[PDB]
């Protein structure tokens, strides 16, 4: 996937919005640009709204201005997004027709919702046992253990949709640029899994501070806070708030602290291992290939839609992969996930990915583990044998503040 | 104008909870959405949470917090924070983190020509009179609203009005100043990031 990052960035063409004008530089030294048009498109929220072709004729360091129509103005809520293609109507000697050889996205104007939501006559029933919250809805329910402090199990009809928790997670399976020159034998004390693993960020056990369980007018509202500990030391508190309103909505906000003197954990969010094993993945994000919020400018934002396989690069040394970032909407089956987020999804835990050395050693656990963030860290790739992620894409702001809401 | 789109109050096993919605909109179009919840526990502390929305086409807003007018007026103000000096998130490298108090003619920079002044940023705790507020957030105090600081031209023409005003925000944009006659807030100054959350705890 870092192809296309190299493709964009090295891209012969350079683009500039202002307004409804687009300005086209060439970077080429030599031709002229009779190979080319200019593909643009306009849609709100992955659905297209206006489209348009355009040939190019930019001299070799030239420009052009390229006056867009009067683009469409819904007032139905969302970004709209401005994206355009450089297309290669002919073939060449290395390429085919059609070929792509530039693209560039824009956010163009945003309606925000101020749309109150549908006031359902339903209210989900809070039961309270010495073992756990129970929830239920119609058909649906929700189960939240007491002791540990998660959803433990949530039902559709009489279907469990999880084999694991809805659990925090500030790790992630090493990357090679995390692992660096390290090995058991020589340890390299600078590399981020080094100093992960002697903070104690993979074996940090949580600690649930407080549960409480309230019925609203409208909603149930759980609210729970744990700690990670190693070793006395306090290393994360996260705060959660789970508002189960009528509509069978989960609203889930996390508040996170971290604690300043550990090392900056790789990701702040939440995984859970779902019973489903669905055969495709959509979501409304950046994409379709993986990208990280270091490694995002080749990604454009759309309605994607891929198979699970396509879902999980097959490294050959095992690590963290998969991440889409700038997601707004992600659906799973019958599930589906809104908010701001980082998410991966696949058949092999963080677990299974940290300790297996070669790909052809993994086998796909039983159901979809899912990976929601709402922030991650960067990957970096200055070189791999020191740490060379760069101080804006560190984790390092100290509180960490992310909402999803889960549905069906 | 602030429209409110909705607002419920419920009690808790030991907490009220108000919950409100309000949307800012100018000539139809929605420029923020603000989010917030007020807890008021048995101990007499008022916690707020806010979340904010910022439409990605308006141009960034300067600040993005609370204010109110105290009716207090106290000698001296006292915070932990970054200070003593008023300092700004472009320009807060030669502040220090301590416990700062100062008097409240201190916390106004009488600059001649009268503008946003006196932000402390950093601050964890600050305590003005009985009152006690906690977080993470940027403040001034003042006995000068920002309407009146922006429509006065000289300093020796504002008149202190009755009260403390006080502006809590959670976030501040850059003050910016490598030239004066062109945009200079660099991008990582600029409140760009479209959704904000911040929260408070006001006590006594």
Redo the contacts between chains.
């Keep these: 996937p870092a192809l296309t990052e190299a493709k964009h960035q090295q891209q012969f063409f350079q683009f500039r919005l202002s307004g409804q004008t687009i300005e086209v530089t060439s970077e080429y030294l030599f031709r002229h640009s009779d190979n080319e048009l200019l593909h643009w498109m306009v849609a709100l929220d992955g659905k297209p709204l206006a489209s348009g072709e355009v040939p190019l004729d930019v001299a070799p360091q030239g420009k052009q201005l390229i006056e867009l129509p009067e683009l469409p103005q819904p007032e139905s809520a969302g970004?709209l997004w401005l994206t355009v293609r450089v297309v290669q109507p002919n073939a060449t000697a290395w390429s085919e027709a059609g070929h792509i050889s530039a693209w560039q996205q824009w956010?163009?104007?945003?309606?925000?919702s101020?749309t109150?939501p549908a006031a359902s006559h339903a209210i989900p029933h809070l039961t309270t046992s010495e073992m756990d919250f129970c929830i239920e809805l119609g058909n649906k329910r929700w189960q939240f253990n007491r002791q540990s402090g998660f959803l433990s199990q949530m039902w559709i009809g009489d279907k469990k949709q999880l084999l694991t928790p809805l659990r925090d997670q500030f790790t992630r399976a090493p990357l090679d640029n995390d692992i660096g020159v390290s090995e058991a034998t020589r340890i390299d004390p600078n590399a981020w899994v080094e100093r992960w693993k002697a903070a104690g960020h993979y074996q940090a056990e949580a600690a649930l501070l407080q549960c409480?369980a309230?019925t609203?007018?409208?909603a149930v509202?759980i609210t729970t806070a744990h700690a990670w500990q190693h070793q006395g030391k306090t290393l994360f508190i996260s705060r959660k708030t789970y508002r189960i309103d009528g509509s069978g909505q989960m609203a889930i906000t996390v508040?996170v602290v971290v604690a300043s003197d550990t090392p900056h954990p790789a990701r702040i969010g939440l995984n859970c291992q779902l019973a489903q094993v669905a055969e495709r993945v959509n979501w409304l994000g950046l994409g379709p290939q993986e990208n990280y919020p270091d490694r995002l400018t080749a990604a454009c934002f759309d309605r994607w839609d891929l198979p699970l396989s396509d879902m999980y690069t097959p490294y050959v040394f095992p690590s963290e992969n998969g991440l889409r970032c700038g997601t707004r909407e992600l659906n799973y089956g019958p599930h589906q996930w809104r908010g701001?987020f980082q998410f991966n999804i696949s058949r092999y835990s963080q677990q299974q990915l940290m300790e297996t050395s070669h790909r052809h050693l993994l086998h796909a656990e039983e159901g979809t583990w899912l990976n929601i963030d709402g922030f991650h860290m960067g990957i970096g790739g200055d070189d791999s044998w020191s740490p060379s992620v760069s101080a804006?894409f560190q984790l390092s702001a100290g509180?960490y503040?992310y909402?999803l809401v889960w549905c069906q």
């Design positions: 970004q956010r163009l104007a945003e309606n925000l101020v109150l409480t309230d609203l007018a409208d509202l508040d701001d804006e509180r503040h909402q």
